[PDB]
């Protein structure tokens, strides 16, 4: 079932006082006239933010669960509520398949727990919440308002104040509700023109990009637009498909014949074998744990599998004792000066 | 490979975006790719099949909004500068040398220019937005003859204002 999300869902973006000014700001807001899913529960995606809202007559909804796998495998938010002590404990609790906590539930067998915080309690009354996660901060905004004999979103405009800025720093990837109607919506990045009257308490807003007339209005920061020609945006065509073309060749390079040679040459008379006309799969060498160090210069080690080169030479020699670090561009010492000297613009990697 | 569309291609590590079309530039056997005056590819030789593909950047341009004014109507026209109408409010489409104009109806009779658009075309009247070729002023002729002179019999005094910073 669906209903139409009205002009609801605007909140204070920055905690900065401003007065008598029209300020244009970009953040994640709920688009006007969006639908929002109506439920009468299953697990829903969290993506980039949720406009959770619910109406009721009593305190039937008592909590929320946030996490990634909800199986003690990752850290999971368990913000839960009770009559007078709201408790937040972000720990790897192992939750049941269908939690429904007069006794206690789903938060049993908590091996160890890392965070606890206490606040004053949250919950004919409409209760709006906004949950966003920005750079390691779980932010909740809320407002309570007297609803009347209406069976939907009550029409009109009201801004939401901040309540907590808990420093949890986890992902959160999926969500579920606890125990019966809700309005789940999703936020998207859109630009709004916000009107502050004089004490700073947002009095109006204009949703840009709604239509051609609305775009001119935001650009001029005015509610009336004079006669003329205005430049408002830039058109850019996006590509439709990718095409990958490569030379026809299936030969494999003898990497086993260089790294596993019976006897290596001395550093004063190092060997230089030329490898060509083959397919070189470098993912095994990258993942192989047998190497002590793997420092690549010039190219990053994980994109070297896509790029192509005309020829590669593998110079193999043995060095013992100190100075092993001297094999690098622009280095000095007995080894670099008399034994093996690398060019200044060398592009490649040394493995030892 | 798909031709005649803006695509993001990758030829042996050479990447870019453009429309790939047939060409008649006779590359000699020893050259593989040609470059512009700028350090970017102008054409390229395909592998496996050894053919010459031309690369032309896909079309782009600015968007301008034409509006009559808060005293008349909420209907507006949108001008896509320097783009053709053969690619994307959706009522009428008129192709001009200034770009592709959408939303304005073309009327054959000329009037004095009001809102300039460019390239000689100006553009509310008769319940709709109209576009037309601008008039240069009223046409009149003087009754020239080899033996007639006109002398004024009266005068008027006028006052003008000139403002300079």
């Amino acid at each position, epitope marked *: 079932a669906y209903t139409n999300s009205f002009t609801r869902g605007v909140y204070y973006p920055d905690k900065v006082f401003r007065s008598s000014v029209l300020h244009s700001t970009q953040d994640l807001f709920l688009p006007f006239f969006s639908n929002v899913t109506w439920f009468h529960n299953p697990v829903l995606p969290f993506n980039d933010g949720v406009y959770f809202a619910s109406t009721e007559k009593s305190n039937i909804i008592r909590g929320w669960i946030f996490g990634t796998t909800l199986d003690s495998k990752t850290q999971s938010l368990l913000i839960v509520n009770n009559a007078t002590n709201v408790v937040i404990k972000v720990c790897e609790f192992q939750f049941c398949n269908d939690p429904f906590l007069s006794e206690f539930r789903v938060y049993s067998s908590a091996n160890n727990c890392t965070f606890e915080y206490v606040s004053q309690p949250f919950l004919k009354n409409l209760r709006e919440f906004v949950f966003k996660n920005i750079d390691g901060y779980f932010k909740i905004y809320s407002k309570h308002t007297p609803i009347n004999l209406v069976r939907d979103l009550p029409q*009109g405009f009201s801004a939401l104040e901040p309540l907590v800025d808990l420093p949890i720093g986890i992902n959160i990837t999926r969500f579920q509700t606890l125990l019966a109607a809700y309005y789940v919506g999703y936020l998207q990045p859109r630009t709004f023109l916000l009107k502050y*009257n004089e004490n700073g308490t947002i*009095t109006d807003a*204009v949703d840009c990009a*709604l239509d051609p007339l609305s775009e001119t209005k935001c650009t001029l920061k005015s*509610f009336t637009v004079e006669k003329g020609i205005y430049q408002t945006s830039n058109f850019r065509v996006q590509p439709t498909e990718s095409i990958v073309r490569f030379p026809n060749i299936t030969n494999l390079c003898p990497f086993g014949e260089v790294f596993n040679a019976t006897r290596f040459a001395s550093v004063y008379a190092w060997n230089r074998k030329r490898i060509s006309n083959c397919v070189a799969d470098y993912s095994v060498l990258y993942n192989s744990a047998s190497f002590s160090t793997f420092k690549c210069y010039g190219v990053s080690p994980t994109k070297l599998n896509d790029l192509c080169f005309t020829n590669v030479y593998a110079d193999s020699f043995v060095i013992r004792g100190d100075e092993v670090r001297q094999i690098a561009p622009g280095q000095t010492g007995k080894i670099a000066d008399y034994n093996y000297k690398l060019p200044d613009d060398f592009t490649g990697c040394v493995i030892a | 490979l798909v031709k005649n569309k803006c695509v993001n291609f990758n030829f042996n590590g050479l990447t870019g975006t453009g429309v790939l079309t047939e060409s008649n530039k006779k590359f000699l056997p020893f050259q593989q790719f040609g470059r512009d005056i700028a350090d970017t590819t102008d054409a390229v030789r395909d592998p496996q099949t050894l053919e010459i593909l031309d690369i032309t950047p896909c079309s782009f341009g600015g968007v301008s909004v034409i509006t009559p004014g808060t*005293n008349t109507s*909420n*209907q507006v026209a949108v001008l896509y500068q320097d783009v053709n109408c053969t690619e994307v409010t959706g009522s009428n489409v008129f192709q001009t040398r200034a770009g592709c104009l959408i939303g304005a109806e073309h009327v054959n009779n000329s009037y004095e220019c009001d809102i300039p658009i460019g390239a000689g075309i100006c553009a509310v009247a008769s*319940q709709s937005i109209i576009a037309y070729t601008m008039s240069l002023g009223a046409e009149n002729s003087v009754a020239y003859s080899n033996n007639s002179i006109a002398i004024p019999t009266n005068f008027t005094i006028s006052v003008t204002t000139e403002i300079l910073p």
Partner: antibody
Amino acid sequence: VQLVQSGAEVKKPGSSVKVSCKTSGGTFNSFAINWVRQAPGQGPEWMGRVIPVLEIANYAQKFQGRITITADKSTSTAYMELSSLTSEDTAIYYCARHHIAVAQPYFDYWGQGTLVTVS
Amino acid sequence: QSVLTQPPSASGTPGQRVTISCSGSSSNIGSNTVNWYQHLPGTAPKLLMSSDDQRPSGVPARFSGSKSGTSASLAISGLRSEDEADYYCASWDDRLNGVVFGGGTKLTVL
């Protein structure tokens, strides 16, 4: 643009009356239509509105299932019909338009109005 | 009855200034904007004042608005004969879930 309403109507109590308000071409989609009356010796009162592109309607709480507002896209005309006409329903009816990308309503252009008399 | 209360009558002398007021409650005026409409009988009304501090495109520099607490006012300078009309104040009401209009005032120029 302009809004053109139907002519004056004379009706008997207990009957039904239908009043239309025809608009321009672009005045649908991103525009709402509001209905306002003014009883003699009284202040103006709001009834409801309809968004043609969304076909969703709102009604004043005092009009409990007596008013229904509909609109069609093919002809570009909006309709109002009221049931159970009584003596106190005599007034002048207006249709006025709103811009949809503004949170707080503000009527911009008003129609000329029509007069309905009951006796 | 109109939720917003306005003085039934008001008068002013030519050439001077006059002030009109519109008083309401905390549920409508205190939380939402106000709008001012000019009405002449036999004709359609017009928008004088929008978002309670923002002037429209057409009206010239003279009409000014202000809002304070639960009361709002409109100021007219350079009063002239054609200003004879009715004035209405309107605002959204949260409790009634609809728009509520004022009672209207007759302004008389002596």
